[PDB]
Structure formats: structure tokens, C-alpha cells
Design a protein around this ligand. Sequence first.
Ligand SMILES: CCCCCCCCCCC(=O)OC[C@H](COP(=O)(O)OC[C@H](O)COP(=O)(O)OC[C@@H](COC(=O)CC)OC(=O)CCC)OC(=O)CCCCCCCC
Ligand SMILES: CCCCCCCCCCCCCCCCCC(=O)OC[C@H](COP(=O)(O)OCCN)OC(=O)CCCCCCCCCCCCC
Ligand code: HEM
Ligand SMILES: COc1c(O)c(C)c(C/C=C(\C)CC/C=C(\C)CC/C=C(\C)CC/C=C(\C)CC/C=C(\C)CCC=C(C)C)c(O)c1OC
Ligand SMILES: CCCCCCCCCCCCCCCCCC(=O)O[C@H](COC(=O)CCCCCC)COP(=O)(O)OCCN
Lengths: 110, 54, 110, 62, 44, 431, 126, 126
Amino acid sequence: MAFRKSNVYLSLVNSYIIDSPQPSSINYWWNMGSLLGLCLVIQIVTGIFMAMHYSSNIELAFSSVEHIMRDVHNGYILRYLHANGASFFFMVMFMHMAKGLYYGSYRSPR
Amino acid sequence: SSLYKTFFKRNAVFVGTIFAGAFVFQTVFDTAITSWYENHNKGKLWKDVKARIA
Amino acid sequence: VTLWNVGVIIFILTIATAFLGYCCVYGQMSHWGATVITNLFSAIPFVGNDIVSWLWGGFSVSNPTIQRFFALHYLVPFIIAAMVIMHLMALHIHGSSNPLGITGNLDRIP
Amino acid sequence: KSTYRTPNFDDVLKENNDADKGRSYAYFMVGAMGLLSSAGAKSTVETFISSMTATADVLAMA
Amino acid sequence: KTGLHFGRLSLRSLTAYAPNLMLWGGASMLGLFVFTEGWPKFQD
Amino acid sequence: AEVTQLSNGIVVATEHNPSAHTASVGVVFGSGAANENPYNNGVSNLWKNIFLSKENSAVAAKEGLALSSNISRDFQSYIVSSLPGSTDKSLDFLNQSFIQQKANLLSSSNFEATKKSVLKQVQDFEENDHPNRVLEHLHSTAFQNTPLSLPTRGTLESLENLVVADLESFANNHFLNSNAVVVGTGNIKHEDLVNSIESKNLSLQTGTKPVLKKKAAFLGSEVRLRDDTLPKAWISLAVEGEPVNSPNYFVAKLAAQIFGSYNAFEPASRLQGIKLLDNIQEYQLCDNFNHFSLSYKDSGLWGFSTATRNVTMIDDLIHFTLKQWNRLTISVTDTEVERAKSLLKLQLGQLYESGNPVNDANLLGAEVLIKGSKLSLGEAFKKIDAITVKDVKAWAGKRLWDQDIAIAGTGQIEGLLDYMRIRSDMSMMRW
Amino acid sequence: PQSFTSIARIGDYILKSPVLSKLCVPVANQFINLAGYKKLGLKFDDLIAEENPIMQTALRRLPEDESYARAYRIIRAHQTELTHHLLPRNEWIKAQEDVPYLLPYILEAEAAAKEKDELDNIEVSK
Amino acid sequence: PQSFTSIARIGDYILKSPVLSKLCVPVANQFINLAGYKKLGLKFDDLIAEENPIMQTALRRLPEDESYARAYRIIRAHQTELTHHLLPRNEWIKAQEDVPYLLPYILEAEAAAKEKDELDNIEVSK
Ligand SMILES: CCCCCCCCCCC(=O)OC[C@H](COP(=O)(O)OC[C@H](O)COP(=O)(O)OC[C@@H](COC(=O)CC)OC(=O)CCC)OC(=O)CCCCCCCC
Ligand SMILES: CCCCCCCCCCCCCCCCCC(=O)OC[C@H](COP(=O)(O)OCCN)OC(=O)CCCCCCCCCCCCC
Ligand code: HEM
Ligand SMILES: COc1c(O)c(C)c(C/C=C(\C)CC/C=C(\C)CC/C=C(\C)CC/C=C(\C)CC/C=C(\C)CCC=C(C)C)c(O)c1OC
Ligand SMILES: CCCCCCCCCCCCCCCCCC(=O)O[C@H](COC(=O)CCCCCC)COP(=O)(O)OCCN
């Protein structure tokens, strides 16, 4: 067999995003779950790069967010992508739950 | 037609041209966008005000 | 062999973790241990004064160095725990050895 | 009917095969989508890397 | 004299691999030539 | 072993061999199953049969004469076999009741008993002969809406709507004098056949058959006939090939001998010098395969055909085979070209130098209808020895590297993936 | 691992030599009884690692009387260690019973694998 | 889900009633053609969910001529939606062809499951 099916690590990628059997009549409402995986990656990456410049003391916390906005090189891009990304993360999750409430995805065996 | 190994046949020319153009496009798209922005807003930049206080 | 190669990666990430957290106390050993180590990367040919100025966030071991060392110290223990999961997957397909060093499929207990 | 009698595809087929017409226009568009993504993913990595350099108030006290 | 292997990669496929990294490195030199332009990295 | 053509108005070809014990005399026409429309389909299959019908073959057995016929694309044949001191009786059987007085064979009771025998041959073929009814669908889906796709036996409803008026309509347009070659092989001299033909004024009338409205054209397509109650899976797959009197005729035959044929239950078949057999035998992906190179006057087909019982690993057998086809463009070796030269000269020698004069009469009649003359086995051997590694790589990059395929299958073919997962395997993406 | 063809090529040259077998064979008999595998009721061919396709071939071709006896010696050697004892001296392997019973099956599985691999890498010209 | 025994217990009481079938059956025929499953070439029993052991029992006991025809109607209905079209009106399911072909196999699989379960919970005394 192929190397992507005999390796211990490559077979998990092959059995999930390469050779996974899908129903051929699903529509664009079944795309919301992959898009939520991209939303979690953007929130973790932009938050780790902002945690290098942040102070959590109650007399330094407000002014350190201002330091990221004014002093950090491309620091305004990091915050704006983080604060607006949380609203986009909640909008897709409201559309994800409403699809499964519509098409009956909660019933047995799921 | 008869241009395919000159264009996109080779595995190392399918990724060896789209990585080659990825820097040539990177600097000429950056220059032409900056040139358009500073003529749509001509007269308001600091370069135009500093030449008025000469 | 794959079980031994994932183990070497865990050992490098555990050394990096203990170094980053020792610089967060900011004692007198913490400052001069971080000065000696970060000055070693200024000897790399043709790219030497760009890793060290990106590790410092400035011109010496200063306030941007301590703030970014704590944020990386929160993170690498969670990368180690994901390498531990991949470590036990490579163990499950072959099992353990024994002090005799021969096959053990003739006598097994749960 | 018979299984040797295939239905009609002339509603969607071309009137000329011309085997360089199909393999030139379908490699220009997939190639250009990978050229823009190479310059698109490069610019995002450099902006995250550039935030770890010296800030504006550090270079002022130099 | 039939094609020295020490394994399986022999002369019968390195004849096609000797110009294979003409642009297999040509494109790993060029693959870093993507990701190294804007933060300081110059060539020789 | 030399061939002699001599046209006195009628083409007469003959290869003498004075070490043979029998002799064949027949006539071969230059119109086959690729000269029909979809409503008189398989009408040449009813001209073979009534020539072999029981009242016609009882007359021939009373003089020691055997009958044989064959329907294909681009040609048909009607052969009379006998003893070498009796060939003048063989011409008199072809002259009467096939050429001159061919009306008593087309009765109402002889035709109706024959048609219901041809109706049960094609019905048993459609239910039992699975590796051969899949190769028929490969011609049916690659040349659809084009003359080269009609099946040589006809179909079950195109055979039922066929009356006696349709046969003379076919004979009037296709059994003419210029569309014909008279062959004789075995122990028979070339000059005794020529004088015995012109001892009378044996001839026909008109010539200039119809002129074949649509040309042939390849199309990338697939057809799937799944049957879950059958215990196996049969699959064919091909690309466009090299026609007859193409300059890459022997080059496409040498390329199929590189991959050859296989049988999993023969022990000496498992030891062949084929690099594909290393991946096949590790998990036992198939039972047999064979590579072919078909060629006609319009186009050809180059490919392979398999039959497997491992119905969950079908997509690995297609993956490993199509990866080895890529090596003919990029990394074919010189010891694989020299092995296929020796085996091609042995395979061509057993087809053209067998012992059956009926077999050599269909081979001689086709090459004189389509070229005017025969090519020797010494001249074909001189051409095969002059192929290099560069000629194979020049042919392969033109004909199979990143091209369209035609697929056909039946049985338990649920594990066969769709078109674009197979179509993308026609370029390695490592050159 | 080295190969058993290479080991026997070196090891045979020492034994058809009058001055080499003088020196090395007294050293080799001390290396055997300082290993201590005979005290666990084991021959040497039981100790060979078996997770490779040449060694899996040689274990199928073994006769099944010698295959049943080998499976009991291995089971007896696992139970001996978890009690941290040795076997009684009645049940040690003597020096005449430690025969290479698996070396002929190994050496011909390797000569067939070498011949198959040097016929896949061929440079015959005209 | 409710049961098919409970549905038919309620649904039969409406049909042997002169004033109830006056009101409800004109409403029920409008609910059918406002569902639109006939335009995809489907009967109603094709739509029933089948991941339960009572429904898996009734599908094995179906005759295999009706089992082959049901597998083609489902495949035809998946290809119809990904093109976002409807079938031609020649190939719609008429009102006489929508028969309960699977209800008799379902109702006897449920009566045997009820009888087995009420004989496992028994309080017979002396
Ligand atoms: C803020 C987050 C941004 C990212 C959100 C992504 C979009 C989420 C919207 C939810 C959704 O996906 O609903 C889709 C729904 C049904 O989809 P369908 O499969 O039946 O129709 C496929 C059709 O055949 C084209 O399919 P086609 O093959 O043409 O694909 C090309 C199409 C792709 O663009 C999209 O459809 C993205 C939504 O682009 C073109 O049409 C080319 C025009 C030249 O379509 C509808 O029923 C329309 C209802 C409006 C939904 C509004 C949601 C309220 C918030
Ligand atoms: C506890 C919290 C849980 C969350 C509660 C719900 C939060 C509401 C979130 C708003 C987004 C949800 C709206 C869409 C819900 C999913 C609808 C759906 O899954 O698709 C159904 C329908 C598909 O069409 P059909 O498949 O029926 O076509 C016939 C084929 N034979 O497709 C449609 O009908 C789509 C029609 C357009 C829908 C959008 C209309 C506007 C919705 C209001 C949004 C208001 C935002 C401010
Ligand atoms: C956080 C770090 C680690 C954890 C949690 C971990 C965990 C484990 C566990 C649970 C086992 C099976 C039990 C056992 O055989 O003792 C094991 C075996 C093993 N570990 Fe680790 N390990 C770690 C680090 C390492 C390192 C640093 C190496 C080598 C450089 C390594 C190499 C191995 C090997 C080769 C085995 C198999 C040994 C055998 O089966 O005989 N591991 N490990
Ligand atoms: C049919 O059903 C589907 C299906 O539709 C899909 C799309 C998928 C595809 C799978 C997904 C979409 C899953 C998405 C995966 C995740 C959400 C994983 C979780 C992500 C993380 C844990 C992020 C990892 C953390 C980091 C990368 C840290 C980054 C920080 C950095 C790099 C800082 C570095 C610092 C310095 C100084 C360099 C399926 O598997 C699947 O089932 C078969
Ligand atoms: C929450 C945990 C998430 C679980 C992780 C699941 C997804 C992990 C897979 C993601 C892709 C990583 C695959 C690495 C590429 C394949 C590695 C490989 O070839 O296998 C190894 C290479 O050895 C290694 O050093 C592994 C390094 C791991 C690096 C981890 C970052 C080859 O092993 P082998 O040749 O035996 O393959 C079997 C053939 N039958």
C-alpha cells in the first residue's frame, strides 16, 4: 500500500482529510465546521504575539493595550484582528448550531 | 501549447516559477499601489505642506 | 526507531522550557545566564546581528526580554503534552521490549 | 435500452477537442492561484515577525 | 559492474535524479527567496 | 516464405509453403463492423452464421471441405479449407451459393432458425463472459457517437429488428469487387491459383462502397456497471494509440511488452523482470493483468486490463500501475528496452509463423487490403532492433504524459474512485 | 546489523588459520560462559532478533519439531527472570547442545535476496 | 420517535369516523404535496430513518425486487439535488404509486419486540 496509509502519523491525515467518504449532496452549510477551525487558529496565534507586550496589573493593564496600539510595530493589526475575530468566531458558531437544529443532526446515532 | 515545460509542466517549475514570481510581483505591486495612493491624496501629505512653508 | 526520534524532540523542548522559566525570577543568576546564552547566536555567519536583536527586543537583556520569556514559558509545556500523545501512539503499535531482548508474544498479562 | 448506447453529451461538449486548449487554460489559473498565495502567505509571516523587533520608544532612547 | 546500490537507490534512477535537483534546490534556494525578503537576508 | 500479389483486376495474394499438409482458399472483404449504423448492427454476424448453417455445411462435408469465418472491425472473411490435391473443388464451393446463386441460402425457414441461434449466443455472452464484455464497453465509451464503437456481435434489440431485406441491402453495398481480396495459404502454388481463377471469368460488378460520413475520435469518459452479486471485479483502462501504417507502430508494441502480462497462480509468471510485480505481490492486489496495443486504420488503444478479488484495495492497484507508466517518460532504463526487444520478436514470431493455414489467411488478407503488400518477418525484425531509449521517451511524452483516459468496469467496483482522482495520476509531479 | 554472510566470511578465515585460531578461540570460549545465556536454558540462536523479513523467512522454514521446542525454551526463560533465580544445574544447556540450528536457513535466505537485488540493478548493453 | 403501532392506532380511529375524516383528510392531502418528496422521485417509506434495530429487521425481510428498486430511487434523488433541479414531470411519483410497502414488515417486527419484552418482566406467583 501507499506510504500515506502505512505510516502511524500520515494515516490519520489520510483517514480524515484525504480519503474520507462524504455524501455527494451536501451544500455550503456543511462548510461552517472547517471555518471554525481557522477561527481558533487566528485567535491563538494573534493572542500569543500580544501576550509578549501585556501587563496584567490593574494600574498597568489599560496603558499596556495602548502601548500595543501606538508603539509595537504592526501592533494595531494584531489587536484589531483579535477583537474583530472573536465576533466572527461567534457568528459562524451560531450558524453551525442552527444547521444541525435544522437538518436533524442531533438524533441517533449522533 | 508547445510551451509547457517553459511554463508549468515540471514539478520544480510548477513551484519553481510561482516562487520565482512571488518576489518580482512583491515589489512591483507594492510600488504601483503606493504611487496611486499619493496622487489621489495630492496636496494633503507632509511632503506638500513642507514645500509650502519654504 | 520512530519512538526514539520523538523522544529526542521532547528532550530539547524540556531544556528550552527550564531555561525560559529560570529567567522569569530575574535574580542575579537569571540575568547573566540569559546574557551568555543569547550572545552565542551573534556568531552565526552572515546572519548574526538579527537573531540576537530579535531575541532581545532591543540592545541587551532588558524589559522586552523578560515579558516575552514568560509568554513562551506558558506555551511550550502544552507542545510537550502533544508530543507525549504522539509518543504513546508509536508505542501502542509495537509494545514494549523486555530485559531478555527477544520476542514477548508467548507470555503476556494484562 | 442497451448499455452500449451512451446518452448525449453534446449539450456540454465542445465541437473541437484541441488537447492544448484544455491543458493551457487549466494550468494558468491553478498556477496563478498558487503564485498569489506564495506572496500572500509570505507577507503575513513577516508582519508577525516584525512585531518582535524594537518598539518606537526603545529606539528613541538609543 | 551492474549498477552499485547499497540498498535500492542505484545508478538506474540517479541518472534521472542528477538533473532533478537542478530546480529542486533551485526552488529551495527560491523557496527561502520567497520567505526572506522584507526581514534582512541578502545573498552571495 | 515469400508473398506474391498479382492483380488481373482481382487481387490474389498467396504465400506458398511446401512443407504443409493442408491448404486454405477464401475471400476477405474490406468492410467490417465499423461500416454499419446503429440499426443494422451485428448484421455481419448473421452473414458469418448462415455461411456456417447446417444445410450449407452439409454440402461441403461431402467433398472433405471445412468452413470457417470471422467478423471483426475493418474486415470479414469466409474461408474454405481442404487437402492440397483438392483446391479446385474449393473454388467451386465459393462460386456457387455464395457468389453466384446466393438466393437459396436466404430462405424463410433457414433465416428464422439462424436468428434465434444468434439471439442466444449474444445473450449468453452478456451474462457469462465478463473480461470480454468489459473490453467491449471500453470501445463503446471511448469512441461514442462514431463508427468505431459498435459491438461486433450486435445488441439484443438491434438483432431482433433485423429482417431478410437487410442482408441483401448489406451485401449489395459491401461485397463488391474492389472491396475484396482472394487469399490462399498452405501447400498451394501461386500460379495454379491464378490460372484456375481465370480458367473461367470469375468477377463481380460495381465497386465504390459508401464513404463513411464521420471519422474516428477519442473521448475521455467512463462507464460503470456495478453488480454486487458477482464475486470479482474486472477493469480496463486505456489512452489513444498508434494506428496501422503509423511511424510509431512498433514503438507502441515495445512499450506494452515492458509491462507485459501476469498470472498469480502460475509460479514461473511470478519471477518475471517487471518492476510493477514488486508492489503487486506484497499484498496480492490482483489475480491477472495484461497490457495491449490495438491498432486500426483510424486510431489505436494502448492500455491494460485486470481482474481482482481484493475488492477493498482496488485504488492501490490503479495507483501503482499508473505510477509505472510515468517512468517511460522520465526514467526508463536500458536493460528494460533490451528485454522487451527479445520478447517482442518471440511474440510476433508465434503469431505469424504458427501451423494453422486458416490463421494465416486472415492475417494475409488484412495487410493487402490496407497496404497493398505484405511486410516480411525479416524486415519487421530489422525495425525492432533499431529502437532506442530516446524513441520510447519521445513517444511516451507525446502519448501518455498528462492525457485523457477511458475506463470501464463491472462487478464489485465500489472501491473504484471517480475520474479526477485517477486522471491526476498521469503525471508524476516529480519531474 | 552486520549480515550473517559477512560474519561467516570473517569467522571462517580465523578457523582455517593455525596462528589465528591459537589466539582467538580461547578468548571466544570465555566470552560465551561470561554471557550466561546457557544458565537460563537458552541456545544462542534463540537470542537473535526476529523483526526483519530475512529472519521471518527462516522461522517458517524450520521443521515443526524444532519449532515447538524453541517456544518452550523461551517461555521457561521468561518465568525464570521474574523470580530472579537461575535454573538448576541439571537443566543448563551443555556445550554440545548449543548448535547453530538456524544458520543454514538464514544463509540461504540471504543468498537469494542478494541475487534478486543484483538482477534488478543491471547494465547489460548490446 | 413515537412508534408505528401508536401512529396507526390514532390514524385508524380517524378513518372509521364519519365526521373526523370529513375534516382531517382534506388537510392531510395538502400536507403531502406541500412536502414535495414526489417531485424528487420518492415514496414516503424511502424517507424513514433506518438506524435502529427494528428498521434494520424490516429491510432484510424485504423481497429483493423491491430492494433493488428502492436503491435506485435514493441514488436518483441525491444526483437531483446537487444540480439544484427537479425531475421532469414524466418521472414524478403519482398518487397511486405511493403505497405503504414497508408498513407490514414494520408492524410485525414491533409486535414481536413488545411480546418478548413483556415476557422478560413477569410477576407470576403460585
Ligand atoms: C460572516 C462570515 C463570512 C463567511 C460566511 C460564508 C457564507 C455563509 C453563508 C451560509 C451558506 O453557506 O448558505 C449557502 C446557501 C445554500 O448554498 P447552496 O449550496 O444551496 O448554493 C450553491 C449554489 O449552487 C452556487 O454554488 P456554486 O457552484 O456556483 O459556487 C460558487 C459560489 C460560491 O459562493 C458561495 O456560495 C459562498 C456562500 O459563487 C458563485 O455563486 C459565483 C457567482 C458568479 O445559500 C443560501 O441559501 C442563501 C441564503 C443567504 C445566507 C445568509 C446567511 C445569513 C447570515
Ligand atoms: C442557543 C443559540 C442557538 C443559535 C440560535 C439560532 C441563531 C440564529 C443565527 C442566524 C443564522 C441562522 C440562519 C440560517 C439557519 C440555517 C438554515 C439552513 O440550514 O438552511 C435551510 C435552508 C436550505 O434550503 P433547502 O435545503 O430546504 O432547499 C430545498 C431543497 N430541496 O436554507 C435557508 O432557508 C436559508 C434562508 C436564509 C436564512 C437567513 C435569513 C436571515 C436569518 C436572520 C439573521 C439575522 C442576523 C441579524
Ligand atoms: C515527558 C517525557 C516522556 C514521557 C511521558 C514518556 C513516556 C513513556 C512511557 C509511558 C513509556 C512506556 C513505559 C516504559 O516503557 O517505561 C515510554 C517508553 C519509551 N520511551 Fe519515553 N517518555 C518520555 C520521554 C522520552 C525520552 C526523552 C526518550 C528518549 C530519548 C524516550 C524514549 C522511549 C523509548 C525508546 C521507549 C520504549 C522503551 C521500551 O519499550 O523498551 N521517551 N515512554
Ligand atoms: C467530514 O468531516 C471533516 C471535515 O469536514 C473537516 C474539514 C475535517 C478537517 C479538520 C479540521 C478542520 C480540524 C481543525 C484542527 C484544529 C482546530 C486543531 C487545534 C489547533 C491548535 C491546537 C493550534 C496549535 C497551536 C499553535 C499553532 C501555536 C502557534 C504559536 C506560535 C507559532 C508562536 C511561535 C513563537 C515564536 C517566537 C516563533 C475533518 O477532520 C473532518 O472529519 C473527517
Ligand atoms: C493532540 C495530538 C494530535 C495528534 C497528532 C495527529 C497528527 C500528526 C500528524 C501530522 C503530520 C506529522 C507527520 C510527520 C511526517 C511523517 C513522519 C514520518 O515520516 O514518520 C517516520 C519519521 O520518523 C520521525 O522522525 C517522525 C518525526 C515526527 C515529527 C513530528 C513533528 C517514518 O517512520 P516509518 O518509515 O517507519 O513509516 C512507516 C512505514 N510503514
